[model samples]
Target chain A: QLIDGVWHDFRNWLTADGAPGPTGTGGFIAEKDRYHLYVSLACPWAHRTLIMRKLKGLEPFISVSVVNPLMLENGWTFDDSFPGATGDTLYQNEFLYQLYLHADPHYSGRVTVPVLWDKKNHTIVSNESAEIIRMFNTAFDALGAKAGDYYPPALQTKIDELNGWIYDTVNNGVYKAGFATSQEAYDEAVAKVFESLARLEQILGQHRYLTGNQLTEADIRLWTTLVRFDPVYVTHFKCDKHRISDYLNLYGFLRDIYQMPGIAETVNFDHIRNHYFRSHKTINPTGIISIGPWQDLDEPHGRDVRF
Target chain B: GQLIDGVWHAFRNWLTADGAPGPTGTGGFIAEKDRYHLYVSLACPWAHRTLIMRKLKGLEPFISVSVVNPLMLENGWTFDDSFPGATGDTLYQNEFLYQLYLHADPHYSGRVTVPVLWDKKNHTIVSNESAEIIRMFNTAFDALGAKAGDYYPPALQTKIDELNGWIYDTVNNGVYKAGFATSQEAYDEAVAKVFESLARLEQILGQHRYLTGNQLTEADIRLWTTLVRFDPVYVTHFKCDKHRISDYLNLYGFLRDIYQMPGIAETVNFDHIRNHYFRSHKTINPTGIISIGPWQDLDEPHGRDVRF
Candidate 1:
């Protein structure tokens, strides 16, 4: 949820109200029919927004598109042949980078997924997904049918802090370790990622959801990251220090989240693993995608009777 | 097991060795101009170094050469002419590399090897070891008007020996360690040593011109053959791929430097390298599906010449 040019300690870059900085500084203001959603069923970041969009009852309100998981030097494309690719819903751009260039034209740095575009301005609302999910949670709610609030006012502080820990030590932490430039950095980051997983595993042992008693935005955010962790990150990122299946509670929690209604329809293991390992040619030159470490996410989690 | 051409009888002693008396010999066949022939497969790195040395020293005119077909199967180093770009035997038109070895010595009990130096006068084997053959090529025909490039120059002999010692045990044969290991533990240990040597060599190349420093020698020639095949063969087929040679800064440039050298580039054949490993080693690669990957850009400029 970062802004145009400001850095904040509290992760003040992205939020629904645009609170830590100027309002709508990054791009297009949130609107109704003009905006579109582009995502990869494989991406966790995109999955977060997808679940948020579903929860917000914005499925019909906002048009949606998905990129093929097999990304190469040409970058993420609308190649619909790859089973789940939704193709371009609006402009039909071949590459995702083209959409990013369309958003800013002079944009540099790697173009990423879960883009939230504004059709009226013919530009992006916010490419930073951490903020886009918040917009999806509340922005188009009035225009849509009945929608429920994921981040309740009573649990705002708890959710914010939970998001922070999950974002740093768990979600992005896995990536930092996996894509580390140095051995020391990789060792340090991978250690921290696994350590945090153990901690989260113990925490899940006590609580039903991360916040406990309710399905908060915190659970949704954390769930997306973990769902893809075993399938892709563990091997592709060289985060093979340990596997999530090794942890009983954490493994159950992942299955629990996966087994949740409407979530299984969102989980695409082919795109999830292939998009990361095959696309990252620098990391995996052979592009050998291993369809192993088989996990059953649909199995009975046994959380229902206890929780 | 006996090879078709040569029945390998273990020599307990170095006595009665037919190779030249330079290093290992008693029946040492001295180097002579236009009296020896070399047989090689362009696919092999061990044989490649000798061929490159032969070409570099203008020993091509002195020693007649023949190339075996790249596809070596159950019958090792065959002369299968159906393979693309295969050069049939120029001397005897034999169907195998071993056939030539049998021609050299009927009672020969050694691994039928290429870069073989055959004595035309004695009608006997001179040398089969690539290291010795290249050394022979380094200076053997110098009196016959081929000027001395001095790859093993007198001044850098100590450094060259030291570098070759480590590079041979670690990198040149390191890929074999990973490739031929019967156990996971052996593979792990071998692959680790391979990377460790790579890390060490990368550090060395960062400071030196050749492996010995500012001199292209046997050390660099020996090391270059292995490095050229690192990205192509070793990374995938050998599974020594914790990292590709291209990933290293100094080693990658060093590879390109030696690859672009005059006459040296012609000695390497990727097709042979690919076909040999994939088809020959059926146990290692069952499918024999030669993967096209880990692109090598060897024609790129090497910045070593600019350095003082």
Candidate 2:
């Protein structure tokens, strides 16, 4: 939940045997159709969960209800005027915060998307996307998830290392730059964003993925933000030191991932554009949408042959 | 229309037949070294035209200059020497440009604008209009050793006037109409005309070196002042965000070409342009946080020299 830009994470992990999770409180066992997901297509964190849900083939089991793209005075709304918005398919709620109130009325914290709801227990499993995607990676393995271990034990250390700085400087860095009140803060944040992209560019240039040949949780995490970079973050966030399209390696990597089966379905361009430009009145007060700096993601990435 | 009396407009010493009456011959407004002073705001695009014309025609030796403060608040275009390029009124030490207007005629009631060509000897304005002032700068001081640069050539009169008419309506004043527009439909229509003109000009510049082919005219100078500020100011503040000036191929090159011209680089001040528009117009940008403009290098190699 967010009040004045403070995110209060509600993390309760989901395990296979209904045992205690490594961190959060848990009786959240992996069962088909036992948990539902609440997400916003506009959100990058929620986009990760949506991608994982598609990759893990959890679509049939874990039911999802997408909140409307526009986040305004009430925060994430249930207005379904936009195309992809499902408007709280579970409980038919008017607001995403109402679902949080249902989880616990006394819960006074940041109510955010990518919330895993335990249907039987009638409480939130986790509101943290970083934790939710990890849960979806394995919890459905015994119950016939698609054959892929995105977070293999061998690459866990490497993925964590990449996640740490990439999360701080690039993933959340755009937010820091865009929401900055002063020039000094914006300069510091926007500089970090481009520098981080430069490092990633050098890394992505030589390797097929962030972790050697296989696409791991690290690439997925970075790709979510990278896809939105030129469209939203570059202009809206004022992170225009350089664009993702300007990078030879990063742009190809974006198209390479975007062209993935069912992965393309998860990404919605109109929802992404409308949400940040129209919602954030502090940055864009006029609410007039930018026409372009357009990109065609469907182009042949040429990453497969190069790597 | 702004000044009821300064209509010794297109002539040096002779007032037009139907225009305001003036002293028959004080040489009617003589052009001599240190005889007339130029008043300008480094920010105003209209004011910018006269500055570039003065620089290009080598009229600097003959004329005196004073720059007003960039921020045009309620009292409008003050002579505050606070900002970097602003030189507070050197003549009579006036507090505002309106004070200069009033000094000319106490009955002067009009919008106080810049690029005021004042006759210091006569203690009145020679002309306040940029288009007329630049034409006066084009040839009026030629006998005083002003450089030989005929921007408005005799043969190009019909074509130059035709180009100026539409470019003024659609591109020059169009940005203001779009930025200050209250209705969405009004902004849409106004902004559409701005890009349509820019897009057409981009094609023309690609084929030819300038708008009216190889030669740089007053038409080019008039359009250049607006183009130089388009990306840095208008695109964002005015919400004319369809495409930036850098996004255009030849138009950007042509911008760099003129910017690199001798004495031309010194005339442009981005600080003055940015602070004035982003700060002065409170309704358009209330935050007054001057954004770091888009990536462009006016000093870079333009290659327009190879174009015929």
Candidate 3:
């Protein structure tokens, strides 16, 4: 397991003022069309960056390149065979690890998505998603990114508290459940996934969002997993206690989030289904992806009345 | 499970009135109380036919039963009482089902299957074929009592036989064909045939209560076992995931209508049904982790009574 020491190497921040950036020895200033975002439509972590980029109207400043969802022996290659998997645009590099090598000549870590690459510096800015979104949240605010602030100073404490358990039990819990070798491990992981789901469902029944009606980064983080819950996680991951459709308030909340502008285009079922079922041969040996259980995410959310 | 070749098994004998064999093999295999015993697995839809017929025809007093365990691995069905409904070999106490085949004929070579009717008098199996066994149970003990009305009446025999032919190849054995498919093409064709049959049957059932008019015959019983297991096991395990019984309006009600019938509900066990298909077949489901979803309730009121 790569510890926090290896993960924090590229964890530098993009700030408005460049006078000794927050918790950073060095810094990057927010510049228009200067950073390239590399992402996989299949990934939840990468997905948040796209959601924030869309919500904040930062698309003109930050460009993106989607990798092939069918990750294999070479990990994420720059193959343009898949529909949206536009090959490596920044460097003419063939593989994603090459981009990592370009950043740090002798880097030792697993190549992951949601990579914030600086075109000017010709180095990787940050690969950590949570930090990238926070930087993307307010670094471009002075450049007229958007009016809304997802992570404000007032509710940051409560949002951080919710993100702590939700990331452990729900976001990563489904992964632990699917890859579990023993029945005991599977049972343990599945219990946490549903326990957190019920906990979230209980919370959403009262307020429109996780914290009152803000629609903070907490909801964006949780929505990526929920959108993929019924289709991918329920069958492929064996997290089959109950589908999101089985819950009333959670379904309404999910619909409310998906119906948000620029949200639906980010969700690609072809990429999502192909990546999980086809990539993990240990989980599904046949690689015969199911044609069905494709849900209608465009239904009338009916959550606007909750206000 | 591969009956597409169609030369299935050997002891496909018949039981008739007055102790003279009506079809297939030997004589003196008459239908009488206290002379025959039934061997079954609650998991098997083939064995389920005989169980339903025995209960419906009130043959519980006459023919006693031995239930095999749900799981069938390298060695086929065995009598293990660890499971709730599986009453391990009541009479001879044999461990494996193949032993019963060997006891019936020392030179036996066919597959070991259920719905076997054994003769206590001759110490041999009467019949191993479920299609024939249900017909036997229809009228075997007519004079000696335990005679529920004639399921194979002469009026509907022609219509019943025609329905049996395609429905057996398409629905009854179709699920096995889909589940055991080695290649994608074979599975696609078998599943298409199954849903096509179900889709057309759904419309036919809308017109009448049963497959052939108002009367419940051998065809209904034959199709019932498959439909009962469709949602719980086949929909997911067999890759027959196009639709569930719930997706079809008339067929879902028809399944529940038959399930709500007296003594029929007792024969359907989801525990055996789910575990056997998901756990036993290691080739298909390598993990053997059973799914606890697609929750079904047959007790829901079916309006087939008014439809008829």
Candidate 4:
């Protein structure tokens, strides 16, 4: 994965030949028990893939290695301090970046997440988020699984188009604004972040999902970031244009996604808070966790009947 | 936290005196026996100061009072009967506090403040400010041969003035700044000043019997009101959770000492303090669900008597 440039698109790995080129460099084949997912539950990016795994009924075949969300100075670690982080269930390594270095000894890149590891070959299949999600889309479907198809052929065109725009403007736009190193970077990124939200608010004003009616892969990708937008990212990341709760349509939509079966359990507020508040000591010098903006995801979501 | 055009505005203005200028209004009112009345919500810190002073200087009999509903709403202050520990305005049965201010002065062009002293003879407000009322209670009515317990003692007046200046600026106003600040910048500045003053107060109390050394001066009374409400209200309600008052050995014991003083414990009502801050201030606490925990033993002997 050429992780040098600050490229926002997750489709950088796909080649014009309709194949995975930037990382795997060939036609991708679906295999059972061949891949293992590594993620930090705190990370909204990794959460996208985990949700896709459960929704696609690939949880049993595709094993997971949960990294400690309290990623300090060196970045996301495999330490056993946090409860769910079992400390590198594969190699028992202390740090997470070591896995990246193993992929290529000279790999000097931003050690990011949703690292789909080819366990049979003992190497990383891909580290880019969008590719990892698409990989999970069709990875273990033939294993007698009940998890229904989200990105069905009938809705493919609508799903892919909306996903591209939302990913660029809103999903990754928040990161571009938050982690910006300069005022110009922050100004440009923050503008895009709100512009996209205002547009999404209007979009959800009309339809249930980006694909017009049914919940698709379009919903899953955006849900992870929007869930944590107000809780941690608003204050800590300085993305406080407005809270998610302040927007009526977006907030109810978030709760609707949360109330979906097996979806709420994937979203952990403690991990989201601890990772942002404790780990980002530069942002929060006191390591003070704000126990506020209490969201009610379990309450009745009136998304069944649209206005 | 932005519920502006409501009753909480009246509540916020009662204690929010930091940014405003000095002695803003005299209200053209004077204290007279049976001519003025006090309307207070006992849970409020600003209102509590007046209540404590009234008890200390024997102003309870001469003055009549009626308490409003503790659970305030968008209508400002209410006369809702369902409010636990709530008492309706018995005199006129007014639904809101603003209605009283409006009735007294048709064009009353300022924030409606509490610990209000009304001149029944003149048919006008004596004073709406708590600070002036407490001072009036200090030495106004000695005609009835009330025992002279000098809080602003003439002997140590200069020292009492110095200590009160610090306590009012740093400790009293500091809690509100930390609680109500919208931005992180405002919160950061507020919490720092709060701890700094607390540290200085801790050092001063370590060597003295009272805030102005040995004598229970006006400064002690001012600081005690905030301290008594510290653990229950400020620590959680205001989000001033850097360190609890219990964590400070000197401050906690000092608070217990002031609390155990004769007539002082009875003056404080936990139900009022908790209900007022939590239930009334909906912007700060939305659900108005009062949390009851952190059990304290204030009646236990304070080690201050041995020092004196």
DockQ of each: 0.03, 0.28, 0.31, 0.02
Candidate with better lDDT, 1 vs 4: 1
Residue runs of model 2 more than 4 Å from their true location after superposition: A1-9, B1-30, B102-110, B181-184
Candidate 1 per-residue C-alpha lDDT over A1-102 given as tens digits, one digit per residue, 9 for 90 to 100: 112422111111232333443445543434456667788887788888888776676767667888999876566788888887878878777877777776
User: What TM-score would each prediction reach against the true structure?
Assistant: 0.52, 0.89, 0.88, 0.53
Least well predicted 10-residue stretch by lDDT in candidate 3 chain B: B1-10
Q: Highest DockQ, which number?
A: 3
- Report the Cα interface RMSD of each model, rounded to 1 decimal: 13.7, 2.6, 2.5, 15.0
- Alpha carbon deviation, residue B247, candidate 2 (Å): 3.6
Candidate 2 residue-wise lDDT at A164: 98
Clash-forming residue pairs, model 1 = A1-A13, A1-A14, A34-A119, B8-B109, B9-B109, B19-B126
In model 4, the Cα lDDT at residue B125 comes to: 64
Query: How many clashing pairs does model 1 include?
Result: 6
Error of 1 at B119 (Å): 1.9
Question: Model 1 chain A — which ten-residue stretch has the worst lDDT?
Answer: A5-14
Flag clash pairs in model 2: A1-A110, A1-A111, A2-A110
* lDDT tens readout by residue for model 2, B1-308: 24345321122232221233334322356466777788998888999999999899898887789999999887788899988878898988889778777776766656778878887877887777788778778877776688988999999989999999989999999998888877667877898899889988888888889989899999999999999998888876776766778878899999999999999999999999988997888765555666565667888898889965
- lDDT of all predictions, in order shown? 0.72, 0.82, 0.84, 0.70
Question: Which structure is stronger by DockQ: 2 or 4?
Answer: 2
> Could you give candidate 4's per-residue lDDT for residues A1-307 as a string of tens digits?
3243221122223222336655545543456666688898888789988888777777776789888878766677788877777778888877667787766666655777778876666777677776677656654456554556677899989888888888887888777765666556766877787778888899898987666778887898889989988776665555654668767788888988888878887887777878876776543455555544446778886887763
